[PDB]
């Protein structure tokens, strides 16, 4: 047997007390199922995760945060940016202005990250940190730019470590 989304959402109806907030990172899809008088006209949302199971949730600030995040995850420009990176001199086919404005809204103008890693340098582990600086801009001409500056350093600006000069045979 297979039911219709309305039956699925109203299965647990009514919802009287709040649900635990969850992170958008865990969810992979969402569906808005509206109800009428049967559940005080409440708007339920069926949230699909990567483990193949549905979570019906009442509209809330965090649920909306999930909706907005999942909404923007699959925007075209995010998907085709790597394919544009693979194609060399002949590689570019223009993008739409609607995605340019969506990219602007979703992507923050600048982000900086420090990420620690350990590399095995013979018998010792050398801790080093990568300072990542990235810019995402949508100019007034609906042009989009993504700049990244990846940098590896030693925890105390030490020279000639094993994170700097890793000397790979290629």
């Amino acid at each position: 047997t297979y039911s219709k989304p309305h039956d699925a959402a109203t299965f647990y109806c009514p919802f009287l007390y709040p649900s635990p907030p969850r992170s958008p990172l865990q969810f992979s899809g969402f569906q808005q199922v509206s109800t009428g008088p049967e559940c005080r006209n409440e708007t339920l949302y069926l949230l699909y995760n990567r483990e193949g199971q549905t979570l019906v949730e009442r509209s809330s600030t965090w649920v909306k945060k999930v909706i907005w995040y999942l909404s923007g995850r699959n925007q075209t420009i995010l998907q085709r940016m790597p394919q544009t990176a693979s194609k060399p001199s002949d590689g570019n086919v223009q993008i739409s202005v609607e995605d340019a404005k969506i990219f602007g809204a979703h992507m923050v103008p600048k982000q900086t990250k420090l990420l620690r890693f350990v590399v095995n340098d013979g018998t010792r582990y050398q801790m080093c940190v990568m300072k990542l600086e990235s810019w995402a801009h949508v100019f007034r001409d609906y042009s989009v730019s993504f700049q990244v500056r990846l940098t590896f350093t030693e925890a105390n600006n030490q020279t000639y470590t094993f994170c700097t000069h890793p000397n790979l045979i290629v």
Partner: antibody
Framework: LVELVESGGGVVQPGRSLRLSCAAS????????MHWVRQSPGRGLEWVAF????????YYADSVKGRFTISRDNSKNTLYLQMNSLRAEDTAMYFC???????????????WGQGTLVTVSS | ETVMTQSPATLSVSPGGRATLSCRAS??????LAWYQQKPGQAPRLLIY???TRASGFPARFSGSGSGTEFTLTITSLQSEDFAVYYC??????????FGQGTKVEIK
């Protein structure tokens, strides 16, 4: 390759019945659902009916409810649709369509057959 | 529960141009929108699924934008093989899966 071949579609007056069929190949016909979507010449698309993977639950459009009966044979990998008790409808092309579930309750038409033309008029 | 409306009915784009065809949802559709291409006298073919992901057999020229209520299909460098009718459909409210009246893209 996935092929859906529609057959059994002719011309009847009102009150008579037509029985479309769709021969499915390229898939076990058991993993996914089948649908019917009609398109009247120069008009939009209209959903007609859906049958669940196990044929236990059928669904129909309000504009067609009561008249039609969808069926499937998971052993034969074949789809039928009996259009009993007919009437006035300009919708000409009936297309058999295979679906695909993105998630439990997220499924849409994935493949379409060449469709059979059905005209119903006295 | 959600009737999908599309505009314009006909859009004249010169070859190799860019066409932005709109689809507007009467009621929330989330990201459950799919676009189908239908060349004359042929069965429809899935074109785009999800709000943006293009289905196999359609080149990177076709981009899918939109969220919530407004969705728009953008077709760049429109070649001869791109002139057909495009329908948008919602798969959020089930019975019935509603389509728009479609938009025809003709050579200017």
């Amino acid at each position: 390759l996935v092929e859906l071949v529609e057959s059994g579609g002719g011309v009847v007056q009102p009150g008579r019945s037509l029985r479309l069929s769709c021969a499915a190949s390229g898939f076990t016909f058991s993993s996914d659902g089948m649908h019917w979507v009609r398109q009247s010449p120069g008009r939009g698309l209209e959903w007609v009916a859906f049958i669940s993977s196990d044929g236990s639950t059928p669904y129909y459009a309000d504009s067609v409810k009561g008249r039609f009966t969808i069926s499937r044979d998971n052993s034969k990998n074949t789809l039928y649709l009996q259009m009993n008790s007919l009437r006035a409808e300009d919708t000409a092309m009936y297309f058999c369509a295979k679906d695909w579930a993105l998630f439990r309750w997220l499924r849409t038409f994935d493949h379409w057959g060449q469709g059979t033309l059905v005209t119903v008029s006295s | 529960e959600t009737v999908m409306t599309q505009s314009p009915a006909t859009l004249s784009v010169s070859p190799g141009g860019r066409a932005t065809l709109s689809c507007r949802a009467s009621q929330s559709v989330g990201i459950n929108l799919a676009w189908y291409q239908q060349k004359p006298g042929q069965a429809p073919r899935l074109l785009i699924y999800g709000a943006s992901t293009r289905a196999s057999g359609f080149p990177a020229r076709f981009s899918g934008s939109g969220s919530g209520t407004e969705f728009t299909l953008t077709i760049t460098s429109l070649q001869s093989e791109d002139f057909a009718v495009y329908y948008c459909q919602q798969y959020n409210d089930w019975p019935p899966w509603t389509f728009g009246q479609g938009t025809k893209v003709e050579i200017k």
